[PDB]
């Protein structure tokens, strides 16, 4: 189960065998390992990865001692890849070669307070034929005296997006080790500049 931290940079399309393949480009490595979770010590198996160098003038003493025991420069993000134990002490884009398939996890874009039609694709109301101030309204939310309440999990308005999303089984179209670049076919959650996690796929 290989994985690596990265930043989404943006999308384009390349040409491969007279086909245009939409790609999103990810700057993955290099990811130093700063702690290993062992079954003896922690109860599971994972690597805590670091990513992106940080101004030591910004890193407090508790964190600075965590990096010290690792022998690692201060870094902006720590994330674990579960069930991943790399041989080296540095993980780079070259753990993927073109043709492989990955799952990419990001923070989706945040719509704030989303109405019922954007959040849940409700049908709204009519826009004429007498419709009275309910054009984007959700309609009924229940029954009557039985059960005289509203189901937990009822689809209603509220905050939407800015949440963890994994999109799965993305073809790795290319890797450019010289630049820590990772091209992947399709779309990836979140904005340009967002932090993403790239993991070997769980589909078969």
């Amino acid at each position: 189960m290989k994985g690596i931290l990265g930043v989404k940079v943006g999308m384009t399309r390349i040409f491969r065998d007279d086909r245009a393949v939409p790609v999103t480009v990810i700057l993955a490595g290099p990811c130093p390992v700063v702690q290993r979770r062992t079954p003896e010590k922690d109860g599971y198996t994972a690597v805590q990865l670091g990513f992106l160098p940080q101004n030591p003038k910004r890193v407090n003493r508790p964190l600075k001692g965590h990096f010290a025991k690792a022998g690692v420069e201060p870094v902006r993000i720590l994330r674990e890849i579960r069930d991943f134990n790399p041989e080296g002490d540095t993980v780079t884009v070259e753990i993927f070669k073109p043709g492989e398939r990955v799952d990419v996890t990001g923070t989706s874009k945040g719509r704030g307070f989303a109405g019922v039609m954007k959040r849940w694709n409700f049908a709204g109301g009519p826009d004429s034929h007498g419709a009275h101030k309910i054009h984007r309204h959700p309609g009924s939310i229940g029954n009557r005296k039985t059960p005289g309440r509203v189901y937990k999990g009822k689809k209603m308005a509220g905050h939407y997006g800015a949440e963890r999303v994994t999109v799965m089984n993305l073809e790795v179209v290319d890797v450019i080790p010289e630049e820590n670049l990772l091209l992947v076919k399709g779309a990836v959650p979140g904005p340009n500049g967002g932090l993403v996690i790239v993991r070997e796929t769980k589909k078969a």
Binding site: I14, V25, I176, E179
Partner: protein, 131 residues
């Protein structure tokens, strides 16, 4: 990082410079590699370009022609490797960047609006006097 530069870096392998410059209003012949049945030929599509939307490597352009009584618009990626070559056939002088208005015009109404870009025609003939 510089995210814009990295994307330009990714695209650089695919950028083309062999193709000639043109402008909306220019009549043009795109020699294009199509696949049919089992083999691949080169099909020419000749028409007026009515639009050039620019996004660097991702720029595309739209070419309009009338075929056997029917309007046909074709959108090409400017850096597509399926484009063998582009022949300028004529230079027209447009007044605006997008020429959708010619869709609702007769053949003579178009000829009156898009007259020969005499200036850039002389620029073409002045070039190709390279010796």
């Amino acid at each position: 990082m510089n995210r814009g530069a990295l994307i330009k870096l990714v695209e650089s392998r695919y950028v083309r410079t062999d193709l000639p410059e043109f402008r909306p209003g220019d009549t043009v012949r795109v020699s294009y590699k199509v696949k049919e049945g089992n083999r691949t030929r080169i099909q020419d599509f000749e028409g007026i370009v009515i639009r050039i939307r620019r996004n660097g490597f991702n720029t595309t352009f739209t070419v309009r022609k009338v075929s056997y009584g029917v309007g046909v618009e074709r959108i090409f990626p400017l850096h597509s490797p399926l484009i063998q070559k582009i022949d300028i056939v004529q230079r027209g002088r447009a007044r605006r960047a997008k020429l959708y208005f010619i869709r609702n015009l007769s053949d003579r109404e178009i000829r009156r609006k898009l007259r020969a870009d005499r200036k850039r025609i002389d620029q073409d003939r002045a070039a190709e006097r390279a010796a």
